[PDB]
Design a protein around this nucleic acid. Sequence first.
RNA 1: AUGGUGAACUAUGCCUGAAUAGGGUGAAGCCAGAGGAAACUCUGGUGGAGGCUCGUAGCGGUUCUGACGUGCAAAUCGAUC
RNA 2: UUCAAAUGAGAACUUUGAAGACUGAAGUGGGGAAAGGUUCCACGUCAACAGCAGUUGGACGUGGGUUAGUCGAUCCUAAGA
RNA 3: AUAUGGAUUCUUCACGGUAACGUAACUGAAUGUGGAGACGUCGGCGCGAGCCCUGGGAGGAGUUAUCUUUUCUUCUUAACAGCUUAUCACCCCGGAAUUGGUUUAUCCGGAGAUGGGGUCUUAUGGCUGGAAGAGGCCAGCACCUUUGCUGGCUCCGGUGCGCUUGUGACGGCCCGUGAAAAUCCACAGGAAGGAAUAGUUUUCAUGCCAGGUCGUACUGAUAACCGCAGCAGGUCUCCAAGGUGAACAGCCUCUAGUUGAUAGAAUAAUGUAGAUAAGGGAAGUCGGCAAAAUAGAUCCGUAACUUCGGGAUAAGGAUUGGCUCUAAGGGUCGGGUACGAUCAACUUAGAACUGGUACGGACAAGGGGAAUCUGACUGUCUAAUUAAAACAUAGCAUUGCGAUGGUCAGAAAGUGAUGUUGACGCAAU
Lengths: 100, 77, 50, 63
Amino acid sequence: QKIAKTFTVDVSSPTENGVFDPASYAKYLIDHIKVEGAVGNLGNAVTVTEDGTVVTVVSTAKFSGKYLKYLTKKYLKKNQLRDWIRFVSTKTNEYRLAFY
Amino acid sequence: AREITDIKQFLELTRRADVKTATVKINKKLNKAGKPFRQTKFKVRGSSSLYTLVINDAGKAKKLIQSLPPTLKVNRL
Amino acid sequence: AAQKSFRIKQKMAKAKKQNRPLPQWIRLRTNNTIRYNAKRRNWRRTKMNI
Amino acid sequence: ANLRTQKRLAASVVGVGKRKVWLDPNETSEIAQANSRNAIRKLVKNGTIVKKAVTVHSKSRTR
RNA sequence: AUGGUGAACUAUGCCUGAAUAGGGUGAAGCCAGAGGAAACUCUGGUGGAGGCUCGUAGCGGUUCUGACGUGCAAAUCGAUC
RNA sequence: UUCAAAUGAGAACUUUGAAGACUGAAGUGGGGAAAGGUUCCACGUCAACAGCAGUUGGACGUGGGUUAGUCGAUCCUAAGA
RNA sequence: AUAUGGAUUCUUCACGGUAACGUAACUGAAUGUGGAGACGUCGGCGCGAGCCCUGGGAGGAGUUAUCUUUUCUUCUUAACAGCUUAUCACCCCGGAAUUGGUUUAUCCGGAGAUGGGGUCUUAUGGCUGGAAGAGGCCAGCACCUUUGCUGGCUCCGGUGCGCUUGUGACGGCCCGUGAAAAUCCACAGGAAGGAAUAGUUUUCAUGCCAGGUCGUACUGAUAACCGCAGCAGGUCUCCAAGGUGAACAGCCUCUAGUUGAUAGAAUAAUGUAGAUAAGGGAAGUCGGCAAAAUAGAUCCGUAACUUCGGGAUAAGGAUUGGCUCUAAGGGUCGGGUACGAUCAACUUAGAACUGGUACGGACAAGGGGAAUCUGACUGUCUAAUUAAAACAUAGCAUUGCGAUGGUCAGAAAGUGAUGUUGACGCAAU
Ligand SMILES: [Mg+2]
């Protein structure tokens, strides 16, 4: 009914090399997460908290990891970080960014 | 390829003088969404059939490990 | 055919043994005239009719 | 070189058709030595024989 | 003329198998309704019959008297059927 | 059909990659029956054959390969002999 | 071959249920009876399986100037075993008209309906064992390396005139009524053998040993078969994705497989194949041969004649896109002994608006009418020049024959076909 799921993104690795901005990544998610098909309709249903090494999303509305991958891959292409960063899931809802 | 429910018959069957090997298998199952448990299967190799006794209680399962005769070749995996 | 009688496969083994050229040293024999194998058979040229 | 046998085994090893198997052109010499299925399995693991991406048939216009 | 060999093609019988979209039409049987001097007649459903029909696969082979006609082929190829 | 690389004395035709296409599931796909008989696979190899070519091949030389109480036959009978 | 456990007996060879019947077994010789083996085709209807479609979630890949909670892809569960699961069928109670029950399809009930309660077939389905340890999809860490190792996830649903296939209960059809045996089981019958300090059952369970011989590779066909060949021919069969669409049509795509047929340069005549033409519209020609036109679907309308079934899609008209809407057509849960909620199919009809009057927009797809000759029709034949007015056919009619027979076969026979036949037949026209 009102159960909340927590999605964590480990952005620790690419932030030291200077090619990634963790603060902007949380900002990007806020504006573009669609909740019943609307941007900005995140009326406390979802919440993106960023602390410099990990970005967490807590949602009671519809949300899935395959959506979060879609938005993250949207951002890296937008900023030309593709073929340099991969969105990878280490385990369930424990996604991580790989630089290699 | 058979199931037996009573622990009494397993201890009788494991000394059937045609039994040479038996296996202990560990399975992580989910009864309720609140908590997982450990489900262990005790199998015994008979000349014509494989009897699998399924035990769900972890405490009762441990009591059955040392209950087997020492002459039995027990496989744990 | 795949399923076959023992007569057929036995007679094919005979025809498989016989399928290779002349031994080389035979033409080195004294008073030899056989220059090659005139009974060589291939599966694409002539059929065994067995 | 002649790598038809190597491509034939790779299709059977990876479980796809020959039209999908990709043989590395710059690593031709190594592939020519892969005469068994065990060798092809070694070459698939280390990226010398990548399987492929599948050709898509989208149902977005049908939906 | 004598003696043999052929039904691996083809003809017919018998035995045992196997194959044959999607449409049109809408027979008996059945249900309800309507008009009714009765008698009886009419209407709408249902149903899914026929060596029926349009038309695939299949089986065939009408016309172009088309292609080819020292061919792909000692009978094939395309269209139409 | 095209571009490039590899091999070779030699590449329109072999291999690999890339691109462009086709068969379009009653297929140019995957299995069999009859028939064939080793055509299967590897290695070497191009005098002859693949009506151009050839380094390639169902070619040539040399070898390897078919594992059943349960799949068949083996048993019954049919029309028949 | 064989022992133990189990089962049974002093009421010698089992009990329980009113019953249909049940169980772990639960003596049964000769002989006899019954069943399975064991059977057509079509039509529609119910159920199952695989596939197809689709939602959430956990992974991977693609696009990302813009948009896309997005496109593609993995999420599987065998033979065998236990428990349960069934339309049909049957048993007990009870006694029916104000007849009722009921199928898509109209059959059943005083020879026992409706109803209430039970028994059974286990096709099939579900759960569990097999079995996640397998397979699938990913992540991380080393390496000449024979190479690896370690982790996770592999979950939960929905829908249907869908496709293919299996199965069930029915119906239609027949002057057609749609094999045989080996083998397997059951029943009736009472031979014989048996119990007490002890007997009996190997249709219960478990335990032991063996299973010979020949085949097995490959192609199965515009290159492995047959056609003088690596031949545009011929050759029996199984599985069958998405879209458009009535459609295993035609066209495009996915899986899989090919990219094979001597090439290069120019674009003369004449060819083969494909096409278009002003005005006329068969004047061409033996002859409209060839080509053109018509063509899907919805609505309207449809003559002569007729064996009343047809003719008929007769002839002849209109419409057809896109977009925004409107209306109708269902399931399951909710009441002291009218309606509301939720969920899910494409089906039809109607209305505005919109466009270079277009819209079965490619593909796909009847030209029609009035007559005469002839064959009634469907069907069959001259493989390779004739598909027809020929042959067949039903129907009609005739002829022979009652078995020491008719018709016919055979060198002959203690020989045969019809004949497993019998005039409602067989034979010949
Ligand atoms: Mg009156």
